[PDB]
Ligand SMILES: C[C@H]1O[C@H](O[C@H]2[C@H](O)[C@@H](O)[C@H](O[C@@H]3[C@@H](O)[C@@H](O)[C@H](O)O[C@@H]3CO)O[C@@H]2CO)[C@H](O)[C@@H](O)[C@@H]1N[C@H]1C=C(CO)[C@@H](O)[C@H](O)[C@H]1O
């Protein structure tokens with residue numbers, strides 16, 4: 001039995017006193033409220049909030065039975081007796097507490113009938129997790145395939161079809177019960193930790209996500225090389241093998257930006273060496289030369305690191321001496337069994353552990369390491385009696401990886417203020433994206449089921465802050481011989497998801513350069529396509545940094561009034577314009593694509609489809625996966641390069657998909673130096689915009705550039721604009737008012753400025769795009 005007793009509005013927070021204690025409400029923005037119970041006691045701080053001490057001006061009004069605490073769009077309605085808080089956007093109820101807070105920590109909310117609930121981070125349970133319950137406890141799930149209620153990277157957060165996001169801002173071992181035990185009840189539980197939740201509202205799914213990342217953090221733009229081709233396996237055994245692999249990419253003519261060194265870089269065996277955090281010189285004898293030699297070829301080196309320092313490693317004594325490891329209640333360094341051996345865990349929550357760990361990253365970075373891979377941050381093994389500076393293992397568990405990323409991010413920015421950190425990790429918390437965390441979906445099995453689960457996982461993570469979620473392409477775990485068709489399908493999908501990193505246990509090759517001739521013939525032009533599409537991908541990355549908009553978007557974005565679309569985990573949007581349907585079973589001969597109503601084109605074949613709702617049936621082939629382009633799309637390309645270090649935008653090729661059903665369309669291309677972490681903030685970029693206006697007798701393109709530019713920016717770009725499904729009735733082109741004839745023959749065989757290819761229904765315009773506004777008008 002809880003009831004209101006009194007409140008105090010100071011400042012700018014609402015502090016309510018019930019018969020059970022104090023509750024603090026603070027708006028972190030016009031659309032987001034933090035609600036802290038047991039406010040009067042000392043608790044762990046928020047981890048989810050980027051600005052935890054924020055509190056914007058809200059209006060408070062009181063009635064006999066209620067208080068109202070209202071921000072711009074979100075309003076908290078506080079019922080006095082019994083005590084219950086409910087949340088409104090406009091006049092629409094978003095979410096209501098049932099019993100609300102109870103004591104070990106428990107939050108209970110009503111769920112609406114028919115309300116669909118995404119969230120929980122990585123689970124393989126279906127997109128709508130309502131009817132499910134599962135732990136909040138980051139944990140490895142080795143060799144998972146088509147089901148999981150608990151894996152590496154959980155998030156204590158949900159997204160509702162009511163268009164709100166609820167965050168349980170708690171780092172402890174806990175649980176989420178989404179109307180499983182009781183049909184109309186959402187229950188959040190934790191053994192300890194902070195007793196707070198955060199509700200974020202939005203008027204659309206993109207707006208919801210923009211509002212959510214506003215308060216939890218926006219991902220800094222990754223270096224452009226993060227979007228390129230990675231060579232990886234578990235693992236290169238020597239410097240010779242590593243150099244041979246870089247060489248294999250060169251001789252096989254596959255693009256390569258980065259090679260990733262797994263745990264053999266610091267030891268001869270899988271077990272016993274973890275914590276050495278230094279080169280195994282027997283097998284990597286000249287690592288500085290190795291990294292310098294790779295940089296000469298435009299190739300970065302990334303090294304794996306882990307939280308665990310084994311008692312058998314060379315750094316045990318020093319870590320103990322430095323007080324860098326978590327302790328037992330008795331006060332000694334805590335040592336325990338984990339897969340890799342016997343050892344302790346670096347206390348990243350302590351000053352000592354942070355300084356000790358950070359100095360190691362600095363030293364290796366100075367030697368030439370370009371980026372960092374932090375594995376096992378669940379932490380994979382984390383005994384209950386382990387004590388960190390700010391709480392026991394069960395209390396801080398779900399934030400360990402989060403803090404580890406913060407430490408490393410801060411360390412990298414302090415060391416290299418003019419470069420963007422690359423940090424790939426397996427586990428984090430809400431908001432970890434603000435430290436640049438790039439997560440991958442762990443040790444997936446080498447099975448079709450493992451591949452088939454990746455879109456669900458990526459969408460679930462993307463919706464809640466993580467634009468660069470991706471998988472070990474081709475699959476990681478076990479297997480005894482390559483499943484060739486599966487591998488190909490996985491690396492094809494790979495082109496259209498955030499990070500192109502094939503990786504697997506090395507008894508089967510994960511790199512595409514080690515595959516048979518047929519596989520390479522299929523994948524080589526696709527890996528090159530990935531590079532040619534850098535302007536499209538890097539622009540989506542830019543938008544993610546701006547607004548939180550994920551690179552992969554769910555089908556349900558296409559119709560917010562059709563909740564049934566939420567269930568779809570088989571087709572997704574890659575950027576604004578591509579609808580991608582991965583093939584996830586062997587021998588599939590055709591696919592049914594639930595394309596949104598409108599006009600769509602086969603990405604590979606240029607075929608035009610129109611639909612008023614019925615799905616489209618496309619045949620499959622082994623060399624592609626089915627991809628449709630939305631009418632009105634501007635698809636920008638540059639020539640393929642071997643490494644993003646060689647990237648040029650002097651030559652642009654842009655494909656516009658024309659249809660009268662799209663009378664107005666817009667595109668943009670974000671260009672900067674690919675490396676400056678301050679480029680966006682300082683406007684040191686070249687933002688290209690294209691606008692198409694398509695009427696009965698005219699098709700008009702307006703081109704412009706903004707931004708202050710950057711060193712090496714081309715003043716003038718040679719541009720080839722290819723208009724698909726172009727009318728055959730255009731007779732002339734005006735460029736800035738100067739009329740030019742459109743040739744109607746030999747379009748591919750002459751250096752023509754404007755030509756129409758009647759067999760392909762493509763109209764090609766070739767011109768110079770300088771710094772001034774440029775207008776192109778086609779007239780019938
Ligand atoms: C490569 C991974 O090694 C370790 O995984 C162990 C795992 O701990 C064992 O339990 C597992 O046995 C499983 C069983 O758990 C059972 O669930 C399943 O049905 O049978 C399996 C029998 O093989 O054995 C594996 C070792 O093969 C470790 O826990 C795990 O984190 C490791 N993966 C990470 C480490 C590396 C290597 O540095 C990275 O390459 C990888 O990307 C990373 O995720």
Ligand SMILES: O=C([O-])C(=O)[O-]
Pocket residue numbers: 659660696726727728729
């Ligand atoms: O759309 C058009 O104008 C056409 O196809 O002729």
